[PDB]
Amino acid sequence: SDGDTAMKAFNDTFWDPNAKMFWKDSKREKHQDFWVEAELWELVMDAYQHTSDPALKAELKTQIDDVYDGTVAKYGQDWTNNPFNDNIMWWAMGSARAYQITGNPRYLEAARDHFDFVYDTQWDEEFANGGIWWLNSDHNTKNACINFPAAQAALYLYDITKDEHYLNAATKIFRWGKTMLTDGNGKVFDRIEIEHGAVPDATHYNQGTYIGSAVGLYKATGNAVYLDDAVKAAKFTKNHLVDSNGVLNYEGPNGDLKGGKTILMRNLAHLQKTLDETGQYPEFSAEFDEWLAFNIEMAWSHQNSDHIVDGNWATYESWSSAAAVQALNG
Numbered sequence: 001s002d003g004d005t006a007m008k009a010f011n012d013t014f015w016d017p018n019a020k021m022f023w024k025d026s027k028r029e030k031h032q033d034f035w036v037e038a039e040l041w042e043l044v045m046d047a048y049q050h051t052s053d054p055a056l057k058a059e060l061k062t063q064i065d066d067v068y069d070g071t072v073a074k075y076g077q078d079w080t081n082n083p084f085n086d087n088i089m090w091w092a093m094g095s096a097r098a099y100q101i102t103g104n105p106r107y108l109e110a111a112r113d114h115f116d117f118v119y120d121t122q123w124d125e126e127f128a129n130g131g132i133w134w135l136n137s138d139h140n141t142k143n144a145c146i147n148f149p150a151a152q153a154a155l156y157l158y159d160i161t162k163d164e165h166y167l168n169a170a171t172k173i174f175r176w177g178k179t180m181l182t183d184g185n186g187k188v189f190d191r192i193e194i195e196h197g198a199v200p201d202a203t204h205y206n207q208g209t210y211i212g213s214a215v216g217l218y219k220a221t222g223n224a225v226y227l228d229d230a231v232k233a234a235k236f237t238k239n240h241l242v243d244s245n246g247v248l249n250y251e252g253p254n255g256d257l258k259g260g261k262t263i264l265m266r267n268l269a270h271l272q273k274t275l276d277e278t279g280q281y282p283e284f285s286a287e288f289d290e291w292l293a294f295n296i297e298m299a300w301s302h303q304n305s306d307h308i309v310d311g312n313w314a315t316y317e318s319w320s321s322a323a324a325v326q327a328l329n330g
């Protein structure tokens with residue numbers, strides 16, 4: 001598959017087998033940032049699930065354990081001192097998925113311990129009747145980039161454990177977030193600050209985690225209202241966070257946002273699979289599928305001679321270049 005060629009190329013260009021970490025760029029001077037490494041972890045897991053090449057599948061399965069090992073070697077196992085609740089939760093969510101694939105108890109303990117630290121200590125009802133703080137060092141804002149990923153992490157932990165506590169957490173987080181961090185119609189706000197209120201800046205990765213938490217809640221509950229929520233957020237994305245030809249936007253120069261199409265595509269694939277399997281929203285499903293295929297082909301067609309795609313789809317960086325690889329590993 002094109003997904004096989006894209007992932008092997010991405011590994012050949014950016015994977016460091018000594019440190020067991022991705023390089024940040026094609027100069028190979030520094031390794032990827034901590035949180036982005038959890039998102040390239042998930043990319044390896046998504047290529048693992050996508051490929052029907054059994055030799056590549058087995059090599060990616062090994063790489064799932066190596067990405068964790070390289071990160072724990074550099075940083076330790078206990079990430080609860082990191083001041084960013086979102087740094088912790090990206091890795092808790094990756095760890096839950098690694099448990100689903102491998103069954104290695106260390107990944108369940110990592111996921112649970114890190115999720116529980118954030119939800120139990122950083123969910124607050126003093127400010128705005130709920131929601132998780134951005135930071136554990138200072139409590140001034142509650143952000144989409146911690147709240148929707150936390151919901152997703154809780155839904156993985158519910159799927160793994162069937163402990164209803166995790167479904168209750170996912171539901172409480174998502175309900176609060178739809179009320180306080182969206183316009184009620186699919187546009188996901190960046191954050192809500194104590195002093196200055198809502199900041200209605202939308203981005204690919206916050207549309208993405210909203211969509212993924214909504215689809216996950218649909219799968220856990222069978223309540224169609226959650227798939228409606230996902231559809232409205234996908235429709236916002238396809239009509240607003242795109243150029244005039246319908247290609248998803250380039251969000252640089254911000255280093256966190258430049259690769260956010262990676263997180264968006266991952267979640268849009270969950271919505272695509274669920275609409276295809278359920279027959280929900282069939283008119284939207286057919287149009288969504290056409291729009292995704294157009295985007296994936298615009299990514300495919302943007303490769304250099306080493307089969308790496310820079311994130312401006314309309315020196316190569318691993319986060320920016322990851323989005324095309326994710327798009328081809330739906």
Ligand SMILES: *[C@H]1[C@@H](O)[C@@H](O)[C@H](O)[C@@H](CO[C@H]2O[C@H](CO[C@H]3O[C@H](CO)[C@@H](O)[C@H](O)[C@@H]3O)[C@@H](O)[C@H](O)[C@@H]2O)[C@@H]1O
Nearest residue numbers: 035084086087143144145190191199201202203254256
């Ligand atoms: C947590 C963790 O990954 C840490 O390493 C990151 O530094 C941290 C970044 O999050 C902040 O910045 C992003 C991007 O902010 C910019 O884009 C926004 C959307 O357009 C805009 O509102 C903001 O003013 C900036 O221009 C935000 O998306 C986050 O909410 C947060 O402010 C990770 O959160």
